[PDB]
Symmetry: C3
Subunit: 174 residues, 3 copies
């Protein structure tokens, strides 16, 4: 019959200890056997996987590595730590606009890179906006920016999943 | 839809979604406001929309203005600040029972007004209960009261949408 | 007609009332396993609306052990557990060092696994109440981070074992898993 195409861009978001990493890793294993694990944790799993460490400028580093042609698909862990890193790389973390600009540029670069990707992507991000509004301006800035980044990625993504207690709700499916 | 509750976390797109719903109501829209980011929605409001400021007693002011007969529909922004105003308008914001009574009365008045309203209403509220329970009694009370208010509005409303990363989930549809 | 149901949601999300409706669907004689240890307004308003045919067993820790010891599973139509949130809080505050995560995680996982076993052998159905606490901002206290992680892990286990899982939003349940 007809050969179905899987999803090109998948966003998995959820709260702390919600199973989003394991669910996204299952998605990535569905991509194939050779998976590019782009880890964003600030530094200063299946045995067939390649781990590319990249705390910032994910589009630049991932494109330069040329590894998109080497893998079956990519799992990005995680938009949360990327947004925080972007906040902490700024001159004044109490000032929102420069952090917002840098983060929006990072997310748009990632979106553009994914549009050209020959392999599919699953991205992991956090939901941080359903608690109480914090007092310090810096924490509110981080929350706002992460929300904006998730909005951008979910608009571009083909599938969006909201993890609750290890179980996925479908927020968007092609 | 006659009554729609759109609620979501911080920077979840709930305002934009409710504004598109309200634009779907018509061109003459009553923006009932209950209050960097205010200067983005002020400088974006359709000039055929009428913005009525009403920090408390929303049913009273909206009924007295007689504007229900002059507009195509209503957008309430937002139940969150209504809950906070009601809490900090109490004699002792650390005592939960009177604040709950005042807020329940406010919400029931709004519900009654909407049942008898000739135009449809879309209400925006926040989800604040899915983080860690904060220390000060006022914050816990505010969380509790907003939760109760959202429960009331969602039960009476015809359609309820839960925003995740800019995308609406249907929690209730007629 | 579900054997194990997890109802979870945020603060004041209607999860207690929804789980109580589920339990009333179980039957008329319900074992209300309460884990709170005393806030008075919550408990008062909850007890007020409790059916007089329900048996309230207060059990702050070792829920599986205590419920088995009470022998009350053979006296009721079903069980409502209120709530996994305070069960985890109790487990955290019963440790020597609440800033040390691993012993707390071990204690909570053992509690949950015992509860799971008891539910597997239970002659009556169970509806469990838990909270969502992980979608706010990452708190500062290490004890708070441990509590959040542990409750999340506990909810993951319970939802994996459960037959039906519901996520309350503003009093209305979304189905996350249905038999
Ligand atoms: N009084 C009054 N308040 C306003 C007006 N415009 C916006 N606001 C308030 O400004 C606040 C800022 O809202 P947002 O920028 O959308 O923040 P947010 O709720 O986290 O973002 P979303 O989830 O996308 O809605 C809102 O809660 C509104 O109530 C206005 O014209 N008058
Ligand atoms: N010890 C004891 N605790 C109880 C009893 N009844 C209720 N509770 C506890 O009191 C708490 C009150 O719950 P709620 O008032 O509904 O607060 P909430 O969970 O944020 O609100 P919902 O989301 O609607 O469930 C629950 O967590 C129970 O654990 C009881 O009889 N004995
Ligand atoms: Mg808003
Ligand atoms: Mg409860």
């Amino acid at each position: 019959g007809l050969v179905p195409r899987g999803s090109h861009m998948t966003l998995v978001l959820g709260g702390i200890r919600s199973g989003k990493s394991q669910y996204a890793e299952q998605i990535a294993a569905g991509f194939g056997k050779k998976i590019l694990y782009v880890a964003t944790a600030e530094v200063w799993r299946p045995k067939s996987w390649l781990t590319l460490e990249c705390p910032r400028h994910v589009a630049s580093a991932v494109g330069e590595s040329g590894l998109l042609d080497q893998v079956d698909g990519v799992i990005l862990e995680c938009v949360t730590l990327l947004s925080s890193n972007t906040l902490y790389a700024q001159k004044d973390p109490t000032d929102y606009e420069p952090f917002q600009e840098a983060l929006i540029e990072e997310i748009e670069a990632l979106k553009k890179l994914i549009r050209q990707s020959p392999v599919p992507w699953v991205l992991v991000s956090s939901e941080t906006g359903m608690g109480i509004s914090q007092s310090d301006a810096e924490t509110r800035h981080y929350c706002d920016g992460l929300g904006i980044a998730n909005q951008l990625l979910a608009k571009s993504a083909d599938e969006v999943y909201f993890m609750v207690a290890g179980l996925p709700l479908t927020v968007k499916k092609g």
